[PDB]
């Protein structure tokens, strides 16, 4: 093709959007932005498919153009704006705050947070570099650049950003024994304590993680997002606490819940 593509076929859309197949030919192509195309949830999918606040894309536009939707503390009127991991969505008209947080199935849950929690977000620092006559700079997964970070902050650490001012207020190092979520791969959405990091120079480091129920998995280092110091998260977690039940336990839990009614 010549130049960039502007459309997204509904069936080539990320499967975690949980789009059906008969609504249309196209899926809302996420706009360029802080998060990657396949690692984001567009505002239209959140406000229409997840929250059911709108029935069509026209109503999503009508909501967004009234400036009711804030993403990370800023009003966004782009209905395909890419909202991704850790992003805080505030709807002040209805007085509700959400944080885009993965499910254990790898999907962005509708996770409501308190207005006090909506003041900050965790960000995994993607790189640290010196520029502009010795000024240290830090780049996060959110793609926000921060000048003058703490000298102890390194790549793969997690910082806490106050959304009102956008400066670092705390940080967790990437250490063994720290709680972390998985943001990609087969184990996407799982939460556990980092056990050990096997280093492969010139290749991908593998991080082993142990669930709160004792289940051990492993991912690439690029898929690890440190959540809290020790085993205590710095953010609220969804109803499932990052523990991925097998299909047998899911079936048993569903049957127990169904048999408890009636």
């Amino acid at each position: 093709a010549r130049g960039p593509k502007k459309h997204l076929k509904r069936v080539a859309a990320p499967k975690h959007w949980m789009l059906d197949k008969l609504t249309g030919v196209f899926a809302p192509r996420p706009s360029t932005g802080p998060h990657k195309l396949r690692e984001c949830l567009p505002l239209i999918i959140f406000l229409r498919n997840r929250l059911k606040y709108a029935l069509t894309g026209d109503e999503v536009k009508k909501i967004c153009m009234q400036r009711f939707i804030k993403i990370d503390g800023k009003v966004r009127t782009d209905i395909t704006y890419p909202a991704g991991f850790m992003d805080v969505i505030s709807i002040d008209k209805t007085g509700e705050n959400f944080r885009l947080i993965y499910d254990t199935k790898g999907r962005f849950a509708v996770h409501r947070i308190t207005p006090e929690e909506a003041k900050y977000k965790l960000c995994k620092v993607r790189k640290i570099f010196v520029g502009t006559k010795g000024i240290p700079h830090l780049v996060t997964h959110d793609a926000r650049t921060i000048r003058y970070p703490d000298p102890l902050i390194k790549v793969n650490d997690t910082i806490q950003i106050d959304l009102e001012t956008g400066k670092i207020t705390d940080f967790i190092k990437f250490d063994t024994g720290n709680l972390c979520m998985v943001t990609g791969g087969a184990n996407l959405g799982r939460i556990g304590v980092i056990t050990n990091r096997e280093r492969h120079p010139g290749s991908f480091d593998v991080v082993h993680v142990k669930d709160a129920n004792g289940n051990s998995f492993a991912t690439r280092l690029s898929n690890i997002f440190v959540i809290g110091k020790g085993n205590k998260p710095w953010i609220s977690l969804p109803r499932g606490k990052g523990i991925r039940l097998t299909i047998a336990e899911e079936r048993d839990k569903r049957l127990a819940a169904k048999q408890s009614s009636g």
Binding site: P136, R147, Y148, D150, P151
Partner: peptide
């Protein structure tokens, strides 16, 4: 903003090198 950020990072950086120097002095001394 530039001046305030530079001053704050100067103080924090000085404290960080103080911590690193103290830790390394303790390490070498023992």
């Amino acid at each position: 903003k530039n001046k305030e950020e530079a001053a704050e990072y100067a103080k924090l950086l000085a404290k960080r090198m103080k911590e690193a120097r103290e830790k390394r002095q303790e390490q070498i001394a023992k």
